[PDB]
Q: What sequence folds into this?
DNA sequence: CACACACTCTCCAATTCTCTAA
DNA sequence: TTAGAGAATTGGAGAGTGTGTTTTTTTTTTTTTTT
């Protein structure tokens, strides 16, 4: 069985605070991140660089008026992968409508949206369907904390100190760290699939499959409600037109000759850059 | 050999009829289409051959099913 | 314990919404007829309606199997004959 | 090691069949 | 001969026994014949 443990993080309160930050932050146009999301909706930008200096300033500002925060900067430097999903979910909730005449000549994703919505609606009245990542047209990143020069950086802010490949111990796994070193071998760009868009020969229903495993198994089984109730046992066909791809590059960072202790050999660390 | 020539003509004719369904290009060309059938259905059937005629698309719809019935059957 | 049984042509399924009322409504406004055109095109257009009705009513079985099963049911099950007699009586009034 | 494949072991309800039905 | 009550059989999903991987010949020495 799986035991249970008690951890004082409270992801729900953190998500509420995250939504408040994305709505009620204005750097010294409206809110900065709402303006950024407006630019994203206009398809003029696809990179949400969530700065950590801004989150620190937001926490400091609300510290004087209620301390309505749980040290988010210290809560995502400890586990950043989950908070990428949290930020993406908060952005999808507060995504403004476009305020520009964007050409929709290539709207395959929008076409699938409306087509599947109409097919579902013609039977919903009886006269989530889409994976969250499929609809997203933006990549979310984190900008690490800058220099603090204050008591806040009391050995904290591990993303502020540029480490070396040797100092990346095993207990840093999952944290948001920064390394300093010389790139040695960057690979070519390859399209890494995030969600496949299988289409069935009959039953008309297309089923998506999110994948982050470096290797997956195709479904090839029309488990849709109509196909199962009719027992047609249809097979699935991939549709790269309706699939979602993200550019993937696999760099490799070494360490400078000044960071290597005497008598040792420089180490290396694989880097997976993807998105923009 | 006269009957040989006639049989070659007949088999050439049937082979010509056979190639009327095959695509001008390779199988992996990926010809995908949706038939706007009654009830605004968006059923997806593959094949660039179906893009030529709607009857070919309907036949590809018919033979896509893998289920078949039982046909009964029977010198000293 | 037991697999889900395969759906068969039940009597209730024969009277689906996309069934007898649909074909009776669209018979006079779906298929066009012209003797000038080749007979193969007319025959294919005629069979198109029944094929689509069968598929959107029963996508599991194929064409020939569906028609054979329907013919056997009509020859065996008398409820279909009773319904046909009722519609014939209704049409006789005109 | 274990997840996926190929396949022997095994099993009830829909499909066929012929005695008694109308 | 017809619409309908009885026997009789066997295919399609699933319990299960045993599989099959990952898995590698670079770079570095040492020899040997020609050069
Ligand atoms: Zn299917």
A:
């Amino acid at each position: 069985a799986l035991p249970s443990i008690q951890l004082p993080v409270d992801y729900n309160n953190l998500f509420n605070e995250i939504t408040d930050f994305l709505v009620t932050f204005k750097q010294d146009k409206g809110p900065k991140y709402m303006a950024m999301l407006q630019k994203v909706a206009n398809r003029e930008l696809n990179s949400v660089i969530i700065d950590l200096d801004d989150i620190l300033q937001y926490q400091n500002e609300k510290f004087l008026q209620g301390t309505q925060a749980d040290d988010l900067v210290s809560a995502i430097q400890q586990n950043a992968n989950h908070f990428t999903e949290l930020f993406c979910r908060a952005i999808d909730n507060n995504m403004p409508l476009p305020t520009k005449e964007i050409d929709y000549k290539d709207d395959v994703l929008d076409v699938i949206l409306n087509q599947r919505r109409l097919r579902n609606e013609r039977m919903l009245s009886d006269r989530e369907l889409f994976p969250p990542n499929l609809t997203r047209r933006y990549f979310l990143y984190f900008k690490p904390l800058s220099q603090n020069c204050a008591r806040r950086y009391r050995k904290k802010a591990i993303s502020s100190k540029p480490l070396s490949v040797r100092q990346i111990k095993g207990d840093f796994l999952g944290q948001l760290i920064t390394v300093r070193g010389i790139i040695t071998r960057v690979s070519d760009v390859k399209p890494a699939v995030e969600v496949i868009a299988y289409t069935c020969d009959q039953c008309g229903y297309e089923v998506f499959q999110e994948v982050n495993s470096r290797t997956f198994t195709p479904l090839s089984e029309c488990t849709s409600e109509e196909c199962s109730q009719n027992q047609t046992k249809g097979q699935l066909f991939m549709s790269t037109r309706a699939s979602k791809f993200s550019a993937f590059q696999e760099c490799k960072i070494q360490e400078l000759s000044q960071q290597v202790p005497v008598g040792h050999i420089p180490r290396s660390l694989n880097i997976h850059v993807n998105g923009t | 050999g006269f009957e040989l020539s006639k049989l070659l003509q007949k088999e050439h004719q049937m082979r010509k009829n056979v190639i009327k369904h095959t695509s001008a290009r390779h199988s992996r060309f990926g010809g995908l289409l949706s038939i706007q059938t009654p009830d605004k259905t968006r059923l997806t059937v593959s094949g660039s051959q179906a893009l030529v005629d709607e009857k070919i698309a309907l036949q590809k719809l018919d033979d896509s099913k893998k289920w078949n019935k039982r046909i009964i059957k029977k010198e000293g | 314990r037991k697999r889900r049984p395969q759906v068969k042509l039940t009597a209730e399924k024969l009277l689906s919404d996309k069934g007898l009322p649909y074909v009776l409504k669209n018979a006079h406004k779906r298929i066009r007829i012209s003797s000038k055109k080749n007979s193969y095109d007319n025959l294919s257009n005629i069979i198109q309606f029944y094929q689509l009705w069968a598929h959107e009513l029963f996508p599991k079985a194929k064409f020939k199997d569906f028609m054979k099963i329907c013919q056997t049911v009509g020859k065996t099950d008398p409820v279909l004959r009773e319904y046909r007699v009722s519609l014939f009586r209704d049409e006789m009034g005109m």
